[PDB]
């Protein structure tokens, strides 16, 4: 079966501009496990992004957390860019600090 990823982009801690924090991209509900996830600052790809060890939910659909240290600011835009067999183009989801 194929299943499209769900995506949540969010900081680990309450975001405060100027304070160091971690940007997370949680992709879940997807099948197969191969997927490409990039964290983006002002459209460019962040370089040392890390992710958890692949695991899955009760319905056998996978999840991964991608994360990197970051500092929220007033003008930088952060996002998560996800590509998967079920997507005709990459999905970009912009980080909103209220969610």
């Amino acid at each position: 079966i194929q299943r499209t990823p769900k995506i949540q982009v969010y900081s680990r801690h309450p975001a405060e501009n100027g304070k160091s924090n971690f940007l997370n991209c949680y992709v879940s509900g997807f099948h197969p496990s191969d997927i490409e996830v990039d964290l983006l600052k002002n459209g460019e790809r962040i370089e040392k992004v890390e992710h958890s060890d692949l695991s899955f939910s009760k319905d056998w659909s996978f999840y991964l957390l991608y994360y990197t240290e970051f500092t929220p600011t007033e003008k930088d835009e952060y996002a998560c860019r996800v590509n998967h067999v079920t997507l005709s183009q990459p999905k970009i989801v912009k980080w909103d600090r209220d969610m």
Partner: protein, 270 residues
Amino acid sequence: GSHSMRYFYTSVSRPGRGEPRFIAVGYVDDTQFVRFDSDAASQRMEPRAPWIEQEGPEYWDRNTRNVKAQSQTDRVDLGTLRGYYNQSEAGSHTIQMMYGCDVGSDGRFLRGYRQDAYDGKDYIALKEDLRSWTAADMAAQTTKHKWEAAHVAEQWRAYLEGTCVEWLRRYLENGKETLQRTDAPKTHMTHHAVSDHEATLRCWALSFYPAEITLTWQRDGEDQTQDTELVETRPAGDGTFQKWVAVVVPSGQEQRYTCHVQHEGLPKPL
């Protein structure tokens, strides 16, 4: 409270070159404590929680040997199942398996389970009696005949009711300072205007352990689900979890709405 130990295995065939990717992770309740990844350097089962570190060299040898033999069994089985479903050698496929055991508050075995999947769908599962198999289709039925002939369920039952339960109790005493501690959700509500007369109230549950939680809105003491949005519980990335639920409310009428939080770390939540 009750506790569980679970191992999750995933093998993905790589038709263009090499062998399958194999990744194994083990959990005690919602705490990952070991991993193996065939693409990593160690080619060893690796510690992922401070309290497993103390385990001696044979622990790590035996666990490495075990999860390596499983990756090779999965390699063979990707071939076999490819044959069963009559699929070509060109495409990539996946076997996943989850197994484990739960214990109650006194540490006695409560239940065991071992089920697997082929390309994200149920393939063959051990029933709760830990004596028989549920085959989802005719390829798993072939597997189920071989395993009834070889009495494979017996071995699983002996592991799930013995070894699985013995080591989970060991782990629970050893990592007790985090494993037997609940981190009740730290909660607050935010208000976001959506216009000059509507607003979203968002109820935040943060930094909690275990992951299981229920977040719900009431309006004047009765549960509301209209105009609400509930996100999937997500990892904070530090071992704890996060969740929020939001409702759109007429501005000025926010005191009618209460968010109700239910979590193990809470004595009689509401």
